[PDB]
Structure 1
Amino acid sequence: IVPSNHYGPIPGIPVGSTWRFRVQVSEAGVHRPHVGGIHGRSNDGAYSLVLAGGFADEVDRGDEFTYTGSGSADQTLTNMNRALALNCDAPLDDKIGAESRNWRAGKPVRVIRSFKGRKISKYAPEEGNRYDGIYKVVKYWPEISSSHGFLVWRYLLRRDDVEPAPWTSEGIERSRRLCLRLQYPAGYP
């Protein structure tokens, strides 16, 4: 095992790994919260997040994607939103946000794409939850959500991983080579 505050990939779990349910992702240590989309500590940083199509105005290009904080009144740069922002290589700013100076110097975030994200993303898996590797927070900023109408904290994530992304030809070949398959819980119908 690794501690709950482990940064980076989980030993033994390659990019392309796929689980049917969120609890499995949790048990694997890849994304500990069963429900929450962000795992972090507000004065440390964020270790992992889940893309499940929760915000209609988010975008995803695979290598880069935008992501939304949590919290229908205005969001604030506190708790998990604060945690994710601390990953950015830049001073914390809870008024206008910030852009990273050297984006790769930011703290790593494990990124999990859920099949539920298929309604806003062409990169979401067809089934279950897929570990897609390490991303970094390029910048973050507050804005009125186009689709929801209140203030949210938004983030730009960029992939920075030696493991090839699952949708690339190379990633696809690797998943096949390693026989990565959708994993159901032990003893499932």
Structure 2
Amino acid sequence: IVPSNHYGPIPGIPVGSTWRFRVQVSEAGVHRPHVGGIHGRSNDGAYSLVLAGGFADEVDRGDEFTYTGSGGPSADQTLTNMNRALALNCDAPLDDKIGAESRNWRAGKPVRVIRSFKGRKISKYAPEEGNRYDGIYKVVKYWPEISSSHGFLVWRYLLRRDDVEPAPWTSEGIERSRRLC
């Protein structure tokens, strides 16, 4: 229906759609890697990611979350591979030293965000079971941080929801899901 390279909503799969298993999320094309946490191409951008609570308490704020890059914890993370893919979605020239803030955040490339039940103890926005598609998010900004406990650079990303469809935890989103049957 859509290629692997597809940006944005998967047609016929609305916000609030849920799947018991990651393989099913993958089958539906919503987040194609059934193990990898992020789907992207380093020379293009990120298409989807799975959020399971974030790096710390109170990091998932629903409409906004702070995502953490991959790599390392024995080495400085780098703006390569999926880290680079995600940063390319941000509406700003790529900067691998200080990071960048988007000029206009809504103009960024869209990321499909799936919340996993695995973050239910940490995030009030996580589904209580399975996986749920929460819609489109944009990378507002990204920045490097040296961690206090291991002393290596880790990439950090601010994501903010930008979707016409109401978020599943809202009154609108709740009612929409009930109607979809």
Query: For residues 154 and 120 of structure 1, what CA distance do their matches in structure 2 show?
Result: 18
What is the deviation of 1:146? Answer: 5.7
TM-aligned CA distance change 1:21 to 1:64, over 3 Å: same
| Alpha-carbon spacing, 1:59–1:28, altered in 2? closer, same or farther (3 Å) | same
| Post-superposition offset of 1:54 | 5.5
1:52 CA drift (Å):
1.3
How many residue pairs match? The answer is 179
Cα–Cα, structure 1 residues 158 and 54, in superposed 2: closer, same or farther, change >3 Å?
Answer: closer
TM-score under structure 1 normalisation? Answer: 0.90
The answer to whether the Cα contact below 8 Å between 1:76 and 1:153 also exists between their aligned partners in 2 is: yes
Verify the 8 A CA contact 2:53 2:126 in the aligned structure 1.
no
User: Could you tell which deviates more after superposition, 15-24 or 138-147?
Assistant: 138-147
Q: 1:146 to 1:32 in 2, by over 3 A?
A: farther
Q: CA RMSD in A?
A: 1.5
Are the counterparts in 1 of residues 40 and 85 from structure 2 also a CA contact under 8 Å?
yes
Tell me how far apart the structure 1 counterparts of residues 3 and 100 of structure 2 sit (CA, whole Å).
29
| TM-score, structure 2 normalization | 0.94
The 2-side partners of 1:36 and 1:118 are apart by 19
Q: CA deviation at 1:63?
A: 0.6
- Whether the 8 Å contact between 2:53 and 2:59 is mirrored in structure 1 is no
Moved more, 140-149 or 33-42: 140-149
What is the alpha-carbon distance in structure 1 between the residues aligned to residue 168 and residue 83 of structure 2? 27
Unaligned runs of 5+ in 1: 180-189
Tell me the CA shift for residue 151 of structure 1.
2.1
Q: Judging changes above 3 Å, is the alpha-carbon distance between structure 1 residues 64 and 44 closer, same or farther for their aligned structure 2 residues?
A: same
Is contact 2:33–2:39 with CA below 8 Å preserved after alignment?
yes
Alignment CA distance shift 1:18-1:100 (3 Å): same
Residues 54 and 67, structure 2, Cα contact 8 Å, conserved in 1: no
Gaps of 5+ in 2: none
Give the distance between the partners of 1:174 and 1:147, measured in 2 at CA: 44
Partner of 1:131: 133
Quick check: 2:49–2:111 contact (8 Å CA) kept in 1?
yes
**Residue-by-residue CA offset, 1:110-129 (whole Å, 9 max, x unaligned):** 00000111232110010011
**Partner deviation per Cα, 1:160-184 (whole Å, 9 max, x = no partner):** 10000000000000111114xxxxx
Secondary structure of the corresponding residue to residue 29 of structure 2: coil
